Design a protein around this motif. Structure first.
Motif, PDB file in Angstrom:
ATOM      1  N   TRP A 108       0.836  -1.188   0.000  1.00 54.05           N
ATOM      2  CA  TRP A 108       0.000   0.000   0.000  1.00 54.05           C
ATOM      3  C   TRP A 108       0.878   1.249   0.000  1.00 54.05           C
ATOM      4  O   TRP A 108       2.072   1.201   0.308  1.00 54.05           O
ATOM      5  N   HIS A 109       0.286   2.381  -0.351  1.00 57.96           N
ATOM      6  CA  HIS A 109       0.953   3.652  -0.113  1.00 57.96           C
ATOM      7  C   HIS A 109       1.064   3.848   1.390  1.00 57.96           C
ATOM      8  O   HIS A 109       0.057   3.716   2.098  1.00 57.96           O
ATOM      9  N   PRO A 110       2.250   4.153   1.922  1.00 59.26           N
ATOM     10  CA  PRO A 110       2.372   4.391   3.368  1.00 59.26           C
ATOM     11  C   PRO A 110       1.532   5.550   3.882  1.00 59.26           C
ATOM     12  O   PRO A 110       1.596   5.852   5.078  1.00 59.26           O
ATOM     13  N   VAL A 111       0.758   6.218   3.022  1.00 60.10           N
ATOM     14  CA  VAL A 111      -0.115   7.318   3.417  1.00 60.10           C
ATOM     15  C   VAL A 111      -1.562   7.066   3.000  1.00 60.10           C
ATOM     16  O   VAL A 111      -2.482   7.184   3.814  1.00 60.10           O
ATOM     17  N   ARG A 112      -1.782   6.713   1.728  1.00 59.88           N
ATOM     18  CA  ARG A 112      -3.112   6.619   1.157  1.00 59.88           C
ATOM     19  C   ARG A 112      -3.507   5.159   0.979  1.00 59.88           C
ATOM     20  O   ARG A 112      -2.707   4.368   0.455  1.00 59.88           O
ATOM     21  N   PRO A 113      -4.709   4.761   1.400  1.00 64.03           N
ATOM     22  CA  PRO A 113      -5.142   3.362   1.244  1.00 64.03           C
ATOM     23  C   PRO A 113      -5.260   2.965  -0.220  1.00 64.03           C
ATOM     24  O   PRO A 113      -6.081   3.500  -0.971  1.00 64.03           O
ATOM     25  N   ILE A 114      -4.429   2.003  -0.621  1.00 64.47           N
ATOM     26  CA  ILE A 114      -4.410   1.503  -1.990  1.00 64.47           C
ATOM     27  C   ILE A 114      -3.912   0.066  -1.942  1.00 64.47           C
ATOM     28  O   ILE A 114      -3.250  -0.342  -0.984  1.00 64.47           O
ATOM     29  N   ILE A 115      -4.249  -0.711  -2.967  1.00 66.06           N
ATOM     30  CA  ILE A 115      -3.667  -2.036  -3.148  1.00 66.06           C
ATOM     31  C   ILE A 115      -3.193  -2.163  -4.588  1.00 66.06           C
ATOM     32  O   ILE A 115      -3.888  -1.754  -5.523  1.00 66.06           O
ATOM     33  N   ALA A 116      -1.990  -2.703  -4.761  1.00 67.85           N
ATOM     34  CA  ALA A 116      -1.404  -2.896  -6.085  1.00 67.85           C
ATOM     35  C   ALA A 116      -0.620  -4.197  -6.053  1.00 67.85           C
ATOM     36  O   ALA A 116       0.498  -4.237  -5.529  1.00 67.85           O
ATOM     37  N   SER A 117      -1.200  -5.255  -6.609  1.00 66.23           N
ATOM     38  CA  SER A 117      -0.611  -6.585  -6.574  1.00 66.23           C
ATOM     39  C   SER A 117       0.087  -6.871  -7.894  1.00 66.23           C
ATOM     40  O   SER A 117      -0.556  -6.874  -8.951  1.00 66.23           O
ATOM     41  N   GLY A 167       4.230 -10.569 -14.329  1.00 67.80           N
ATOM     42  CA  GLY A 167       4.596  -9.469 -15.196  1.00 67.80           C
ATOM     43  C   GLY A 167       3.594  -8.338 -15.277  1.00 67.80           C
ATOM     44  O   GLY A 167       3.932  -7.275 -15.817  1.00 67.80           O
ATOM     45  N   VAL A 168       2.377  -8.519 -14.765  1.00 72.09           N
ATOM     46  CA  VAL A 168       1.368  -7.465 -14.800  1.00 72.09           C
ATOM     47  C   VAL A 168       1.116  -6.982 -13.379  1.00 72.09           C
ATOM     48  O   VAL A 168       1.663  -7.535 -12.419  1.00 72.09           O
ATOM     49  N   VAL A 169       0.313  -5.933 -13.231  1.00 77.75           N
ATOM     50  CA  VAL A 169      -0.058  -5.421 -11.917  1.00 77.75           C
ATOM     51  C   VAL A 169      -1.543  -5.082 -11.919  1.00 77.75           C
ATOM     52  O   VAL A 169      -2.031  -4.370 -12.802  1.00 77.75           O
ATOM     53  N   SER A 170      -2.263  -5.608 -10.931  1.00 78.34           N
ATOM     54  CA  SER A 170      -3.669  -5.293 -10.717  1.00 78.34           C
ATOM     55  C   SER A 170      -3.763  -4.267  -9.600  1.00 78.34           C
ATOM     56  O   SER A 170      -3.324  -4.531  -8.475  1.00 78.34           O
ATOM     57  N   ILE A 171      -4.323  -3.098  -9.906  1.00 75.04           N
ATOM     58  CA  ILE A 171      -4.351  -1.981  -8.971  1.00 75.04           C
ATOM     59  C   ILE A 171      -5.801  -1.635  -8.647  1.00 75.04           C
ATOM     60  O   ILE A 171      -6.650  -1.531  -9.545  1.00 75.04           O
ATOM     61  N   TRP A 172      -6.081  -1.507  -7.354  1.00 69.72           N
ATOM     62  CA  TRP A 172      -7.378  -1.118  -6.828  1.00 69.72           C
ATOM     63  C   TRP A 172      -7.141   0.066  -5.895  1.00 69.72           C
ATOM     64  O   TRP A 172      -6.363  -0.041  -4.936  1.00 69.72           O
ATOM     65  N   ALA A 173      -7.796   1.187  -6.185  1.00 65.74           N
ATOM     66  CA  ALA A 173      -7.533   2.454  -5.515  1.00 65.74           C
ATOM     67  C   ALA A 173      -8.824   3.265  -5.465  1.00 65.74           C
ATOM     68  O   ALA A 173      -9.922   2.744  -5.687  1.00 65.74           O
ATOM     69  N   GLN A 174      -8.680   4.553  -5.168  1.00 66.78           N
ATOM     70  CA  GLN A 174      -9.798   5.490  -5.163  1.00 66.78           C
ATOM     71  C   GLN A 174      -9.516   6.683  -6.068  1.00 66.78           C
ATOM     72  O   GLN A 174      -9.473   7.824  -5.608  1.00 66.78           O
TER      73      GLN A 174
END
Lengths: 313, 97, 105, 82, 303, 75, 95, 95, 79, 106, 96
Positions: A293-302, A306-313
């Motif tokens: 996660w961002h050490p400040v803003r709630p986010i997930i980026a797995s 070779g790819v990245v699945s990102i879930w954010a706001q």
DNA sequence: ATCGGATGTATATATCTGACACGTGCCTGGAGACTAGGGAGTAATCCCCTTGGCGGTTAAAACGCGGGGGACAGCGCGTACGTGCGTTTAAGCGGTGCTAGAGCTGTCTACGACCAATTGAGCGGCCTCGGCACCGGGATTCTCGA
DNA sequence: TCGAGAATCCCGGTGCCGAGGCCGCTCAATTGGTCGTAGACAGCTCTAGCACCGCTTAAACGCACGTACGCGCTGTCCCCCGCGTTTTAACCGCCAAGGGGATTACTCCCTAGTCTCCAGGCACGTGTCAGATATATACATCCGAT
């Protein structure tokens, strides 16, 4: 604010991508390609920084220095080089008897790097003179011990592969704190990994009995030499019995994540109340490698395959 | 031979296929079709050589029945051909809109 | 120990087998000595009837080997079997011949 | 991988022959595409149910019994495969 | 106290250095002048990178994307072009405007572009090709400033009329039209990080910022001169809580978000400061002025 | 007399426990004071087991000490 | 290798009983195995649900008779119930 | 009053709003007892069952009419004729 | 016994209006009454047998719902 | 001791467990099946009652009459796919008039 | 004669309606329709789970089989919402 | 309407070769023998409403007349499908190795049935009070023929 | 483009029977051991769906053209809807009974469950033959000649 609710696409500046980590507040993304190269992507701007030709045999773990002027990586060919962030060349080179699992830097002491050798005591290397110090351990010396700093790095916690966890000094090496884990009902169990945070001295422990646990970085020293284990939350899955491979912590100090390997069942809870809040609808078919996660803003980026699945706001 | 008038050999073709018993769709194209269409649900699946067959059999049977129903609708519109509207009407009346 | 139960009534198809397959079928609590037996009875009866119509169409077509086509035609052409097996398919069979009146020239 | 091809694999003479066994003489030239569509939408449900049955059983191969189980669940039964 | 002290004095253009913008990634400075030149200078050392050229007359506004790869310049030769930061060659064309190009900016998502001319409308083009997509009527007067929000969903349109407007990117229609009774002309606007406040650089010696939550007049930013020229504004949250803007008294000034206090007055420029830029990852400020200065000042600080 | 209770986040709270006061009364006082349910908290002294149905007089924890308030799940 | 369940000989015998001249291939006993096992599952489920409908502890003959009267139309019901009653008499007479 | 087609839509809208049943009970019941007498007579019934029956039947009928309407529109006319009912019942799969 | 014709003509006129049609041929009523006969007979067969296997010569009210459910339909609002 | 309050549901869990046990669906039932099934029933019934109450709000009736249920089910598409071969007593029909069959004049 | 007792899902759906909308009531025929709806869905899911358990040669009704039943039975996003609610409920129940 | 020719349909002739049936070994379910215990049904009973029948009456339909909009037959036209064929293009065998994969079993540790007994949520009978049924009248919107 | 008449919706005005509440009396829902077990982890054993390429050819693509038919238009005529009326059984109001729907007692008997030897059926070889493959011929049919 609250947990992420939107999902975005993929960030593939280059085709291959293995590992991911944020620096202090999500500035740059360090990817170790499976060809011997280290790529630096620009996060929050969708760009790149530099591509470094490290060596032939690829890398599998990567991190940045306390001052941000060094790029260290747990190479698979035992090449312990301190690659410069600015020039991209090799500053200091050394070879270790064993491969490394997690590389970290003390946010107050850049000289002493963190190493987790296989079947040997953790090695702490001074970059001022290329001198290696073996961290004093207990019982067996051939266990897969994983070492990690505390919030401020003032203490180093080491975990063996039998059920003994030690706490010692990052510079003084005065072993005073030890801990024996609970043996369940009949059989003992080994411990896989320990993951720390930035606020509250919380740390999660992933074990081999298919249950995650959480503790605080202030109980081992207060109990004395050794006391009684006391888990705070025994979180698990009871519908699929999903094994746990990778798992990180939250950036605000209140949430906690447990990850899947092939079922894409990303579970999240919060420390205050241990209930399920959200489950990630991830497209099956890939093995998860890194989550942060961002050490400040709630986010997930797995990152995975070779790819990245990102879930954010 | 020469350019012949329509409708004479269609009847013989209907007689031939309506009596015979075989599989009207080529095997390998159906193989690749099911392989592609099972990608979405789970990747890296491996099929039984007897399962897929079964599947395709059922499929063609269903399709045949549909056409018959479609034909009926065409006869209700006082014509001979089959226009795309008839299939939609048959699907809607059947119950699988 | 002899004289299997299937022959206790002059019958042919297995009845110990069907008795077992209602025993371990987990369908109910007590499994009797008569109900899967009558299931085997309708087995012999309807199997004999159905391969009967198969052979009937076979002798109408003088094949030395029976295909499921004969069975499909027998079930399709009959009326009560057609009503019972309304939603059913037969492997490697076909359609009975039928041509619309308007279509004919 | 997902590519726009391989939908068109089941050729036009195959639809011709299926129609002929259906008992038709004249067919317009623009029914083939929606026949592709209806075949695809029919296949999707059965394959989804089959892969669900095989996923609950902890293997990554579907037998000839999962397909007939799924078909029987839908409403169309199969005779000849177990 | 913000101790911004000058370290590098840059003057390489010919006509007037009236457009310097610090990109949010903070890599290089794309200085622009009214001489169809786009000179790339350094940020922490003032190193000369190159001079991208190819237009026909001067440029009104220059902007880099979030990744600072795309580059839009308000060239008034009825054409706009994107120059690759790595090399400096034309990528795609932006044909479609009917008159001099007055304003143009970029999208933080790096997927949309907005440009404006004297055709009382704002246009967007495909980033891959550069064809005509939409012509949204902005105002009845030329648009002086336009930019996307940090969330990539809204646009703020400012002109010499005065009534501020917030336009939806998803439909092309304005959401809120904030109407001012005195109708004072506006010169520049900039989106807030949360996308709630806007700073209308009004041409009445007042940087009247607006809130589009309910449509209420807020406090008055005085202590500077803003009557005629297109004065810009920028934020600064690295060292403290500050907002930098030029003034028509030939000086740069800085104020607070809601306190209305002068804390620093950057002097040295001999003419009206037409644009201001603050470095994103460092306390470095570069201000561009009109013909009588032709100089760039890099004010560096650590707190 | 006064002692400390430590939460997971790290904050310590100074509280009052009477020598002739059972643990349940202290738990009720804490619940009425800060609102944390007693079913979400428990007493741990230097990694040793403590329950809710007892008294601090029986356990005899020394003065000016800290108790690690291990968080739980409600119920 | 291992053991599995299938009807192979009995179907050939019941084909030989009336029509002692014609053989069959794999597909044939496959479809009859499918019929027997599928009527088996359908029929035992029908019987068991018709059983739990009326609160008992076994499977009987009369519930089966009423279910036969409730699913099957006329002539097939007559034939089936007749042969079933013949089977019940011939089994009960000599056990 | 006059002008067929307009009052038709008036009653069509009333009836698409209304929710009332429209069938009689005594011919219903004599048919019930006679078609039982075909199988078995003098069966001791209930009283609220009748209503139930009616409800279902009405739904049936109205639903059927919808399909027939479509068939009429398929033949490029408005009037519905006995031919469309037979077509709709045959293609539905209830012959 | 003969009572079929009780279902009147404006009643099925009202049902046709419910359905959404305006123009009706005059020779449509006979086969609608035939359809009603067929539906009624199929439902009442199953109803009466469902009661007959109570080991009671009587009839209940849930049996209509049972017959409707097994026929293919299903009714909500009655037990 | 109570068991539905353990999970926060409102449909009973002991009752569902008893009903699943005595219905002879299998010989040995588990312990998480009743709570799972009660939760599913909760979500479905609340999902129905939401639009039922909204349609009641259309008619301002404190009580929700069956036609509101019919409108809520038939107007949605997922619940249409669920209760397709289903009739609702006293619920009426959903308004619809054919596009071609629209008499109009000047 | 001698009185008997019958269970219906009355008070429970009343509580659900009051929790969702605390201003609206319900009728007896709406009560019967909701009871029949619940019974129908319960029977459908339980039967599917039983047949799945029998097919997979298992003698136990675990909680995985019920989730497979609601995946096979419920359409689209409704299945996702239902499985999420069920997993949340079982996770909340187990640790208490 | 009538007759002949090209062309596709239907049937007999060598034979052969892969698939059908016949023969066999011996290992795991099935019936031979037997008990006790728990469901059930069978004789009996008692009260509710359906089963069966009667006095009012009414809004709805059974039955007769008026007329205009849509169904139905015919005719022309140009358009898209069928029938043919030359050819490219990808199916059809066929053969080959096999690596990464599916599948049978020894076993012991975690999980559900059962039971003793507890005891509060929930169901049933009796008020009960208003949401809603029934009713009177005025305000409101629509349609076509002058 | 415009009114008479005809339909529709709403504001009270009043009373009434159903959903809710409450008291009281259960009965089944737990808790904790107890016990028995089945299903889960590792091991070896089998192996086949698949990459790989080679040679061959049915057959799908594409072009040509000829024409049966789908579609649009016109006209005629007949029957469906609407209006009205007189007449009318199907539904309102009640009553009685009887018998059987639901409920109890109970004794008897059907089979779960246990021990068991055999037997009879599934895997593995081995002999044999029925229809495919291609050839040669008698014959029925579209289509074109009169």
């Amino acid at each position: 604010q609250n947990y992420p609710e939107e999902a975005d696409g993929t960030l593939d500046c280059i085709s291959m991508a293995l590992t991911c980590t944020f620096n202090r507040w999500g500035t740059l993304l360090a990817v170790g390609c499976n060809d011997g190269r280290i790529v630096i992507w620009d996060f929050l701007t969708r760009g790149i920084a530099k591509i470094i030709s490290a060596h032939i045999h690829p890398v599998c773990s990567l991190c940045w220095s306390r001052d941000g002027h060094k790029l260290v990586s747990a190479s698979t060919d035992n090449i312990v080089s301190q690659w410069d962030v600015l020039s991209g060349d090799c500053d200091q080179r050394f070879r270790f008897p064993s491969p490394i699992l997690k590389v970290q830097y003390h946010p107050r002491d850049q000289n002493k790097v963190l190493v987790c050798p296989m079947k040997s005591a953790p090695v702490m290397l001074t970059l001022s003179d290329s001198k290696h110090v073996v961290l004093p351990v207990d019982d067996d010396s051939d266990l897969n011990v994983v070492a990690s700093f505390d919030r401020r790095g003032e203490y180093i916690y080491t975990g063996n592969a039998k059920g003994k966890i030690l706490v010692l000094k990052t510079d003084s090496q005065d072993l005073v704190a030890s801990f024996r884990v609970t043996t369940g009902t009949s059989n003992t169990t080994a411990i896989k990994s320990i993951e720390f945070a930035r606020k509250g001295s919380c740390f999660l422990i992933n074990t081999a009995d298919r249950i995650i646990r959480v503790y605080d970085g202030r109980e081992i020293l207060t109990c004395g030499r050794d006391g009684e284990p006391e888990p705070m939350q025994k979180l698990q899955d009871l519908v699929n019995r999903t094994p746990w491979k990778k798992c990180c912590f939250s950036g605000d100090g209140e949430y906690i994540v447990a990850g899947s390997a092939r079922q894409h069942a990303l579970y999240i809870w919060e420390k205050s109340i241990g209930n399920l809040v959200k489950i990630l609808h991830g497209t099956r078919g890939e093995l998860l490698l890194d989550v942060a996660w961002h050490p400040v803003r709630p986010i997930i980026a797995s990152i995975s395959s070779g790819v990245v699945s990102i879930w954010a706001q | 031979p020469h350019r012949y008038r329509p409708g004479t050999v269609a009847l013989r073709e209907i007689r031939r296929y309506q009596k015979s018993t075989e599989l009207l769709i080529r095997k390998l194209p159906f193989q690749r079709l099911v392989r592609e269409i099972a990608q979405d649900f789970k990747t890296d699946l491996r099929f039984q050589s007897s399962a897929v067959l079964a599947l395709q059999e059922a499929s063609e049977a269903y399709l045949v029945a549909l056409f018959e129903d479609t034909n009926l609708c065409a006869i209700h519109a006082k014509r001979v051909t089959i226009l795309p509207k008839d299939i939609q009407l048959a699907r809607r009346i059947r119950g699988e809109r | 120990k002899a004289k299997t139960r299937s022959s206790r009534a002059g019958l042919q198809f297995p009845v110990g087998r069907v008795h077992r397959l209602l025993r371990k079928g987990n369908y109910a609590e007590r499994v009797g000595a008569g109900a899967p037996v009558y299931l085997a009875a309708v087995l012999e009866y309807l199997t004999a009837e159905i391969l009967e119509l198969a052979g009937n169409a076979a002798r109408d077509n003088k094949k030395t080997r029976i295909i499921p086509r004969h069975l499909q035609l027998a079930v399709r052409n009959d009326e009560e079997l057609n009503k019972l097996l309304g939603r059913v398919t037969i492997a490697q069979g076909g359609v009975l011949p039928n041509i619309q009146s308007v279509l004919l020239p | 991988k997902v590519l726009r091809d391989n939908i068109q694999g089941i050729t036009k003479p195959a639809i011709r022959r299926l129609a002929r066994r259906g008992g038709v003489k004249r067919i317009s030239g623009l029914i083939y595409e929606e026949t592709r569509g209806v075949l695809k939408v029919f296949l999707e449900n059965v394959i989804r149910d089959a892969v669900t049955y095989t996923e609950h059983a902890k293997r990554k191969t579907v037998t000839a019994m999962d397909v007939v189980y799924a078909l029987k669940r839908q409403g169309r039964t199969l005779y000849g495969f177990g | 106290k913000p101790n911004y002290a000058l370290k590098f004095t840059l003057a390489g253009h010919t006509k007037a250095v009236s457009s310097v913008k610090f990109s949010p990634n903070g890599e290089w400075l794309a200085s622009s002048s009214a001489d169809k030149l786009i000179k790339i200078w350094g940020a922490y050392d003032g190193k000369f990178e190159k001079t991208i050229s190819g237009h026909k007359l001067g440029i009104s506004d220059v902007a880099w994307s979030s990744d600072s790869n795309l580059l839009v310049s308000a060239s008034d030769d009825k054409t706009l072009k994107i120059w690759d930061v790595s090399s400096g060659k034309c990528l795609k064309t932006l044909k479609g405007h009917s008159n001099y190009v007055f304003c143009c900016n970029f999208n933080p998502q790096s997927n949309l572009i907005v440009s404006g001319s004297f055709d009382e409308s704002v246009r967007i083009w495909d980033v891959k090709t550069g064809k005509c997509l939409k012509t949204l009527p902005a105002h009845s007067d030329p648009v002086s400033a336009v930019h996307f929000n940090r969330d990539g969903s809204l646009i703020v349109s400012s002109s010499y009329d005065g009534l501020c407007r917030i336009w939806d990117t998803a439909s092309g229609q304005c959401l809120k039209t904030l109407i001012d009774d005195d109708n004072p002309p506006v010169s520049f606007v900039k989106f807030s990080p949360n996308g709630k406040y806007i700073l209308a650089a009004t041409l009445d010696n007042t940087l009247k910022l607006w809130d589009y939550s309910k449509g209420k007049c807020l406090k008055t930013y005085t202590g500077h001169k803003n009557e005629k020229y297109c004065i810009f504004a920028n934020f600064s949250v690295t060292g403290g809580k500050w907002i930098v803007s030029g003034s028509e008294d030939n000086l740069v000034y800085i104020w607070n978000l809601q306190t209305k206090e002068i804390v620093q007055k950057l002097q040295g420029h001999t003419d009206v400061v037409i644009s201001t830029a603050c470095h994103p990852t460092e306390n470095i400020i570069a201000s561009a002025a009109l013909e009588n200065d032709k100089t760039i000042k890099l004010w560096k600080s650590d707190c | 007399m006064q002692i400390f209770v430590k939460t997971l986040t790290g904050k310590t709270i100074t509280l009052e426990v009477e020598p002739s006061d059972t643990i349940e009364n202290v738990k009720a006082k804490i619940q009425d004071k800060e609102g944390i349910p007693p079913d979400q908290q428990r007493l741990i002294f230097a990694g040793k087991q403590l329950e809710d149905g007892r008294t601090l007089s029986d356990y005899n924890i020394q003065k000016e000490s800290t108790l690690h308030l291990v968080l739980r799940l409600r119920g | 290798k291992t053991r599995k369940e299938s009807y192979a000989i009995y179907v050939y015998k019941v084909l030989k009983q009336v029509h002692p001249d014609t053989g069959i291939s794999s597909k044939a006993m496959s479809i009859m195995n499918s019929f027997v096992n599928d009527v088996f599952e359908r029929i035992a489920g029908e019987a068991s649900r018709l059983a739990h409908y009326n609160k008992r502890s076994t499977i009987t003959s009369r519930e089966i008779q009423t279910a036969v009267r409730l699913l099957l139309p006329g002539e097939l019901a007559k034939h089936a119930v007749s042969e079933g009653t013949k089977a019940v008499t011939c089994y009960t007479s000599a056990k």
